[PDB]
């Protein structure tokens, strides 16, 4: 017999299985299509999530009742220290897929890059890349590098560079890790020879986020969601609770199948892992690419708000701390908690709609405290509200006797 009343099913079957992700970093499963006409360029970057806040802006959108009016939008702040390029790889097409041809390594590598090959780096012999390092500079090693670069030139169709993060430059106290994160970044544009030339030019050097992304464009984000362990069916899939007088518990699915087929199907909701899944999220607009505070202290000062202040709120980002490097401000939210590393990618979808083409100009950036109900934008404002306090009177009466 058919069901009396109908509704859509609970949950999307294209996100199965709901298992823990294989790794903690976000990795792009595909890169945007290569257009050989353009100039060669990089296509991704790695960043670290540090809290969120909100902004004010005027809207430029003809036909909307919000035209030429001020709106408040929440934003996410992600810290972006420069990456370092250490290698070059190439791929050739086969009837069974893409195959790696070889790898060209840089002549020198960092300790943070080499730490990634150990579990106990401090109490070890620390010999990674020593034989390669001494062999690559003899007569034969130079010949081998020439050979592999010619093989790239002859047979490759895809060129990627190997890059890694700089945790020593990140200088964060709650990110415990000291071994670098490593990823391949594909080079798009130009021909294979031009790609190889660009990749060889930027070897052993560092790359800034502002040389990959521009202020008012959009991006895709690859990252892993927050974990919640073992979860029941009501939270995991959003099924309805049962009436109060139900014997043996209410937070269940009442019927898990018919008599035939004499089986439980893969489409029925069950308890299990929730969270810690990889996700690719589509159209996040960049609102600001901010310089390092050591270089420019007035990070959050706008043209309309002349107050001098940085992007870090009073009392710090809860559980994260101060932002000390270059950073990016994205509209809206991203998957994952504070302190997790994520990947920014150049967009795949068409970028021709009005909302994606709009130019963004900020008017106010909020820097009040995220502990409690913050009501001051700066410490000077708080000091103007409260005059001198008892602690200050004691300080100024015991710092003058000398």
């Amino acid at each position: 017999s058919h069901c009396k009343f109908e509704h859509p099913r609970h949950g999307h079957l294209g996100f199965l299985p709901r298992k823990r992700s294989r790794q903690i970093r976000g990795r792009a499963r595909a890169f945007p299509k290569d257009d050989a006409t353009q100039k060669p360029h990089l296509t991704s970057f790695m960043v670290f999530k540090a809290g969120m806040t909100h902004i004010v802006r005027d809207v430029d959108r003809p036909g909307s009742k919000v035209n030429k009016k001020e709106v408040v939008e929440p934003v996410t702040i992600l810290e972006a220290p420069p990456m370092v390029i250490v290698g070059i790889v190439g791929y050739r097409q086969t009837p069974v897929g893409l195959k790696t041809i070889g790898t060209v390594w840089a002549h020198h590598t960092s300790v943070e890059f080499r730490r990634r090959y150990y579990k106990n780096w401090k109490q070890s012999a620390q010999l990674a890349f020593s034989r390669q390092k001494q062999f690559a500079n003899t007569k034969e090693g130079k010949v081998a590098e020439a050979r592999t670069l010619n093989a790239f030139a002859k047979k490759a169709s895809v060129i990627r560079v190997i890059a890694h993060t700089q945790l020593r430059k990140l200088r964060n106290h709650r990110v415990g890790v000291k071994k670098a994160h490593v990823q391949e970044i594909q080079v798009n544009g130009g021909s294979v020879a031009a790609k190889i030339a660009l990749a060889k030019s930027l070897l052993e050097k560092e790359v800034r986020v502002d040389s990959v992304f521009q202020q008012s464009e959009a991006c895709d984000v690859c990252s892993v969601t927050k974990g919640h362990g073992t979860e029941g069916v009501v939270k995991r899939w959003g099924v309805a609770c049962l009436p109060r007088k139900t014997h043996r518990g209410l937070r269940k699915v009442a019927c898990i199948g018919a008599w035939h087929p004499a089986r439980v199907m893969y489409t029925v909701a069950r308890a299990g892992q929730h969270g810690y899944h990889h996700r690719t999220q589509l159209n996040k607009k960049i609102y600001q690419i901010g310089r390092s505070v050591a270089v420019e202290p007035n990070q959050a000062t706008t043209t309309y708000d002349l107050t001098a202040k940085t992007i870090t709120p009073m009392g710090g980002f809860v559980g994260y701390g101060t932002v000390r490097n270059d950073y990016v401000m994205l509209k809206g939210s991203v998957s994952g908690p504070r302190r997790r590393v994520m990947t920014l990618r150049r967009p795949m979808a068409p970028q021709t709609s009005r909302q994606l083409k709009e130019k963004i100009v900020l008017k106010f950036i909020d820097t009040s405290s995220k502990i409690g109900h913050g009501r001051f934008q700066t410490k000077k404002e708080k000091n103007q509200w409260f005059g001198p306090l008892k602690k200050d009177r004691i300080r100024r009466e015991e710092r003058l006797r000398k």
Binding site: Q93, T94, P95, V96, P261, R263, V264, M265
Partner: protein, 221 residues
Amino acid sequence: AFPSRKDAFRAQRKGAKKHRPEIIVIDLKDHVLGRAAAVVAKQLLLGKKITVVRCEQLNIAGTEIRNKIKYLQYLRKRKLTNPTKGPFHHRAPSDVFVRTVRSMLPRYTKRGMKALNSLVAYEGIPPNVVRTGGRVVIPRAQRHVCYRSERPYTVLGNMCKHVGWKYSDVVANLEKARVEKASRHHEKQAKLRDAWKSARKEALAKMPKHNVEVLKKFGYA
């Protein structure tokens, strides 16, 4: 499969030569799918080692639309309660040929498994096969003797690229480069071939006469 260090050590200790098993290479271009499969399965059960090349050029009788509809009917078969267990539908032409052969063998028995494991299939002609010797055909399964010319027929690669195979252009480019290389080499060897032909033509004056008479009597002049 990468050989193990123990195998390499044993081969060095024995100090033998490079061994190659007895293998037959079949060029499958313009062959009828079912008849070629029927012949190959019987030879595999009789104990041969067989490699087939150019699987994207097999033929099926009928129109491409009719054959594509048959494949889509095959594709819709699926274990409803858990599709990770249901039939697995391979889309490449070499996998299609391998499945056709597997269906004509006692697969569940070990003997059938050995016979099926003795077959290798390729699209195009790969470079590890190109130089191994002359290829063969199956006369009782060729299109120009099997089909009436007026009827339409299908080409397997064309049928497969519309149901999901995604390497047709890669195979086409590889085959183009292959044929150019082989043609240039063949033209370069013409002086050698002609010199040997002339040498055979001229040795008939320097051999003894009574041998030439035997050659003429048996028709080798």
